[PDB]
Design a protein around this ligand. Sequence first.
Ligand SMILES: *[C@H]1[C@H]([NH3+])[C@H](CO)[C@@H](O)[C@H](O)[C@H]1O
Ligand SMILES: [Ca+2]
Ligand SMILES: [Cl-]
Length: 771
Amino acid sequence: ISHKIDIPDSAWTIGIGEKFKNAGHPNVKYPMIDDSYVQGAPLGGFGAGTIGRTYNGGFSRWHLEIGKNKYTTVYANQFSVFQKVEGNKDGVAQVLYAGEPENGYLSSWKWDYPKESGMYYALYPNSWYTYTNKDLPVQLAVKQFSPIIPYNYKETSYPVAVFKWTAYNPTNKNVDVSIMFTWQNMIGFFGKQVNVNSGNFNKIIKDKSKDSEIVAAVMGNISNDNEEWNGEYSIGVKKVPGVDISYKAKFVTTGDGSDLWHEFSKNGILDNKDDETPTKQDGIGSAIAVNFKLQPGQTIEVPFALSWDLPIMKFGGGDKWYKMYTKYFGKNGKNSFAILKEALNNYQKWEKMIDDWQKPILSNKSKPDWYKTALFNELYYLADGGTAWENGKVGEKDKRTNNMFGLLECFDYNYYETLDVRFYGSFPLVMLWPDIEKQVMRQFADTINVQDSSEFKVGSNGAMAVKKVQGMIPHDLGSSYALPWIKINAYDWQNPNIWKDLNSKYVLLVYRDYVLTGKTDKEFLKYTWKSVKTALDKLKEMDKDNDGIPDNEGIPDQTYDTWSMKGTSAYCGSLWLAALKAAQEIGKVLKDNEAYIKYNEWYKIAQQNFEKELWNGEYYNFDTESDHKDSIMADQLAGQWYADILRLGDILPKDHVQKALKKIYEFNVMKFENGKMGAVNGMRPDGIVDESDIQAQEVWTGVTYALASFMKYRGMTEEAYNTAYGVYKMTYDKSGKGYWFRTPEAWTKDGNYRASMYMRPLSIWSMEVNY
Ligand SMILES: *[C@H]1[C@H]([NH3+])[C@H](CO)[C@@H](O)[C@H](O)[C@H]1O
Ligand SMILES: [Ca+2]
Ligand SMILES: [Cl-]
């Protein structure tokens, strides 16, 4: 069957129903998400809410409630197959799901799709399932995707998925085949406080335009309430030559399922029974099937689709917003059929658009397949990370020009656009969706001079601190449990208003976004320039010892929020140097002589003092005053890394940078499990992992990928890919820890993890920056 479909060799692959033996688990004491290794590539566009369908076939990882992660298989949601060989009395019917319900429902359906009988493949945004089963003479495959397309802000938003089936008969008998899509009416699955199924009902739409015929089920509710819970789901199929369509509008999901299954298992043909009766307590669902006869050697292809029109997202602080796709389909929540139809009539164009964007990388035969696997599959997080993309506040009067956006750091630390993390994680956005990236950075610019003098308890030490200080960049733009975009600085473990990295990272992200979009967007530099100057001016005030560099205060006052730095640090110091160099450049572009002169003066003093304070002959010391000061830090030259990307030249001597990178490769990579797991954060110069704090002993996936890109830029090609390979292997390989489609922030040497589904590893896209 893989002969009749084209799956790229770089697709991640696993057997349907394969048990994975090696899997990791959280390495922390507090409760932390662990949804198991049974995952797959998500379906759904940016800001739409996403649905994770796993490699076992189940629709199990629900991100439809924006900002929340709910792992539960909705067992009624499936593809099923019927096959009957010409000359047999009976056919066979089978749910394409390698599992079964726990207790109760749908006992009549044929569960437990057998092992060693099919494969799952993923190369985001595409995934595939092949079915090669000795009791199914006709072989089947499906290609499933959403239209996630760089430089496209329309289709990329859509709450839709397409399932393109291919069926091939390798035998010498005629075989009757049916494929059935079932879906529960999930209105009330979340957001509805009482009466969760009440008023749900299903209708059948038959669209008979010539050379189209679509048949679709629309699963909605009789209420017209404008609430997060209300809207519609649709499933449907497009008629193709040689296929007939059948349907069932209403079967009971909170029952044994035999209302539907006795029809399908007989002859693969449903009753075509319409029934718009609303349910009260029972759960209900719909079914759409196709049936056809395959001659020996014959192939047939048929598309199904799924859409969800859930127009309103609500956050825990009370704000309700329309999702981005509503711009294209409307806001009233009765548009699921329009969305489905658009997909069923345009999916072939979308396939080609995805192929067109993937082709430059896939066709580059100098790059290993593993690297391609990771580059594309890490992109899952852009849609799956609780992504919020608004098209107005519900009830909003004054029209607006922009659509605010946010990606979560992760689900365990439910913070939007954590700036210290996006410094690593935002590369795909600037490179592939630059209008979104510039919007986010304008969001940050707009916060710089916000002051909120109310106080909060700091988690690390119990002291009270001001929420938001004028001139200090925020850690984050809110929490999905509170008020994204409106109440910033949701994070409370430390006080980010005294952090020594955020203001620098902010400036560097600004200049990055100018450089990587062609050095043409002077208007973006003009919008952000006051905030850039304010940010550097405020951070200068933190230089207590007058060496020209902000001083770390013997506490975790930066992204390593449990790892103390004291005095001048390699990390914050290098970031400061590069940020000064960037601001000098912007000064030149914008003809701001006083800023150029001032930042140049600050840069020259700071650069001299940084080298003297920290250069030890082999690498740059972690810091000037900590007990662990001669640790080799993987991220010690983060400022120079960004300076390379920004084309700002040498902030530090080339020979010193080279020695430092070589040391990090020889130590932090190669002496940490033989370089097979990434770069550990801190290593002592005797070749022993630094145990001064948990973070020192962790590999950070996104720091590792960033380090790899830096090594690549500096011509250490073999070291770069070796360093990155460890992250790929841990994430995706049979020898790793089973983290596919949930890449975590960190792991320790035992392979166990902290914070699955994390933003930072999107930094693998920095390996694709083109000089
Ligand atoms: C999320 C998390 N604590 C990390 C460390 O893993 C930190 O960098 C972020 O600032 C925090 O919000
Ligand atoms: Ca200082
Ligand atoms: Cl290997």
